[PDB]
Amino acid sequence: HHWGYGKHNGPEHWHKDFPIAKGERQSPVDIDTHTAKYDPSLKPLSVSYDQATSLRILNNGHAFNVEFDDSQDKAVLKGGPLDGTYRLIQFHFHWGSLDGQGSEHTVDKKKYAAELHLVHWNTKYGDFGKAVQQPDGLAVLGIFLKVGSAKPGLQKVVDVLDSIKTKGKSADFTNFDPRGLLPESLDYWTYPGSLTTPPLLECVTWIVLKEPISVSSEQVLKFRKLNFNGEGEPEELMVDNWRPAQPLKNRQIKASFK
């Protein structure tokens, strides 16, 4: 039926309606530290989120998305492995039912408690819809979350979750600064891949940051209170909305550090 993360319609079943699930550049992948090739030609990332305008937040049944106004070059990403300018359109998380699982990408087989994705599209293409039809259409910045001390800048998001508990609900979310979710260093690993949920299109340049941000037990606990179901249906806790690591096949992961 419509895709999900449960026993009967989870990741292992997606290939039935989305054949691309067995493609050559699928995500996510495990990052083997000793095999990633340090590439010194890679340039440093350029994150310009000072003029970012958040609009709303909404539960879509798979995760929650904070949307931003992408009609002009307000919050952009360039540099690193990129060619051209990429506009931020939205961010979301992937998390688990226990502290030792939740991230999509792994490092030396290690699983973190969750993972943040900041989605951007190539301005060359005009709009998001066109960008998803190109090999270099999207650029997603990935950040790992580990359980420890509380992240001040995450709290604003934690507070509003009660108002978007079930599928379809949305709430205004203006004046949020995404710069409060970044770790100290911008060191990364990069590889060519795809969306981690259907339609599983292969249009993404993945940029996974080395340094994870830490959040509190209580902060992630509130993530686990959301619901997959819409209002009035039986309650199914929104947890473990992550895709298992896919085979790397004929690709290479480059690192911007040694």
> Which residues in this chain contact Zn ion in the complex, by CB under 5 A?
117
The DSSP annotation for 27-71 comes to S--EE-TTTSEE-TTSPPEEEE-TT--EEEEEE-SS-EEEEE--S
Q: How far is the CB of 178 from Hg ion (least distance, A)?
A: 25
- Give the containing element (helix H, strand E) for 222: helix 217-223
Binding residue for ligand FBT (CB under 6 A) from 47, 113, 140, 207?
A: 140
Which option in Zn ion, ligand FBT, Hg ion, none does residue 119 bind, with CB closer than 5 to 8 A by kind? ligand FBT
Residue 141 contacts which entry, Hg ion, Zn ion, ligand FBT, none (Cβ below 5-8 A, type-dependent): none
Q: Report d(CA 253, CA 36) in Å as an integer.
A: 5
Q: Which one of ligand FBT, Hg ion, Zn ion, none is in contact with 203 (Cβ closer than 5 to 8 A by kind)?
A: Hg ion
As measured in angstroms, the least distance from the Cβ of 197 to ligand FBT is 3
- Binding site listing: 92, 94, 117, 196-197
Contacts by residues 53-57 (CB-CB < 8 Å, ≥ 24 positions apart): 53/174, 54/173, 54/174, 54/175, 54/176, 54/178, 55/172, 55/173, 55/174, 56/170, 56/171, 56/172, 56/173, 57/157, 57/160, 57/164, 57/170, 57/171, 57/173
Strands (E), 62-112: 64-68, 76-79, 86-95, 106-107
Distance separating alpha carbons of residues 165 and 237, to the nearest angstrom? 10
In the bound state with ligand FBT, the residue whose beta carbon lies nearer, of 59 and 197, is 197
Residue nearest to ligand FBT (CB): 197
**Residues 65, 91 contacting (CB under 8 angstroms):** yes
Catalytic residues: 62
Closest contact distance (angstroms) between CB of 92 and Zn ion is 5
Bond into 19 cis (ω within 30): no
196 binds ligand FBT (CB under 6 A): yes
Write out the binding residues for ligand FBT, residues 114-133 only, by CB under 6 A: 117, 119
List binding-site positions for Zn(2+): 92, 94, 117
Does 201 contact Hg ion by CB under 5 A?
Answer: yes
Q: Which one of the spans 154-162, 190-198, 207-215, 219-227 is the region binding ligand FBT (CB under 6 A)?
A: 190-198
In whole angstroms, how close is the CB of 115 to Zn ion at the nearest point?
A: 7
Instruction: Report the residue closest to Hg ion, judged by CB.
Output: 203
CB of 30 to Hg ion, least distance (A): 23
Given 103, 122, 197, 227, the residue binding ligand FBT (CB under 6 A): 197
Q: How far apart are CA 157 and CA 213, in angstroms?
A: 15
Residues near ligand FBT (CB under 6 A): 117, 119, 140, 195-197
